[PDB]
Amino acid sequence: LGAFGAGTLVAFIGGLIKNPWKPVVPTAEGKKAVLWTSGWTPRFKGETIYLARAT
Amino acid sequence: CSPPGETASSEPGTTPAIWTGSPSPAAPSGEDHGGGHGAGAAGAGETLTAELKT
Ligand SMILES: CCCCCCCCCCCCCCCC(=O)O[C@H](COC(=O)CCCCCCC[C@@H](C)CCCCCCCCC)COP(=O)(O)O[C@H]1[C@H](O)[C@H](O)[C@H](O)[C@@H](O)[C@@H]1O
């Protein structure tokens, strides 16, 4: 019963569990985690990111 | 507690230099090209201007 409950709970919750620190967002310094990177992170070295006003 | 990194009284700074962006190596596989033409020479393309002065 303990093993079955362990397996079932883990299989129930592992779908939800995700790594926050999986490098996914590309960056000039290689793929990085989402929290480190924002829209201002240069995708490639020397990229121009204008401070565009949102009309 | 205060955050480890704060405050800088010295080193007033400098005016940022004029930004000179670089062509995208990642987004563009190669170099973006403008006018298209046969250009049976070293290469001139489909864009050629000139200003005739006095
Ligand atoms: C007693 C049980 C002993 C086992 C402990 C289990 C905890 C250790 C986990 C071991 C696996 C880690 C290495 C390999 C795996 C790995 O790297 O995955 C990580 C995440 O680990 C997972 O897989 C899922 C984690 C499992 C959920 C565990 C639930 C809590 C347990 C401890 C409580 C129930 C046990 C019974 C006790 C309570 C009894 C009741 C009184 C990160 O995911 P990520 O790289 O972002 O990819 C995402 C894919 O995982 C993701 O499933 C997928 O859905 C995507 O969303 C994807 O993005």
From TrEMBL, chain A:
Residue intervals passing through the bilayer: 1-17
Subcellular location: Cell membrane
Task performed by this protein: Iron-sulfur subunit of the cytochrome bc1 complex, an essential component of the respiratory electron transport chain required for ATP synthesis. The bc1 complex catalyzes the oxidation of menaquinol and the reduction of cytochrome c in the respiratory chain. The bc1 complex operates through a Q-cycle mechanism that couples electron transfer to generation of the proton gradient that drives ATP synthesis.
Family designation: Belongs to the Rieske iron-sulfur protein family.
Domain of life: Bacteria
Residues of the full protein shown: 204 to 258 of 421
Protein's name according to its UniProt entry: Cytochrome bc1 complex Rieske iron-sulfur subunit
Organism, scientific name: Mycolicibacterium smegmatis (strain ATCC 700084 / mc(2)155)
Automatic annotation (TrEMBL), chain B:
Annotated region described as Disordered, given as residue ranges: 1-43
Highest taxon listed in the record's lineage: Bacteria
Coiled-coil intervals: none
Family membership: Belongs to the Cu-Zn superoxide dismutase family.
Protein role: Destroys radicals which are normally produced within the cells and which are toxic to biological systems. May play a role in favoring mycobacterial survival in phagocytes.
Protein name listed in UniProt: Superoxide dismutase [Cu-Zn]
Native source organism of the sequence: Mycolicibacterium smegmatis (strain ATCC 700084 / mc(2)155)
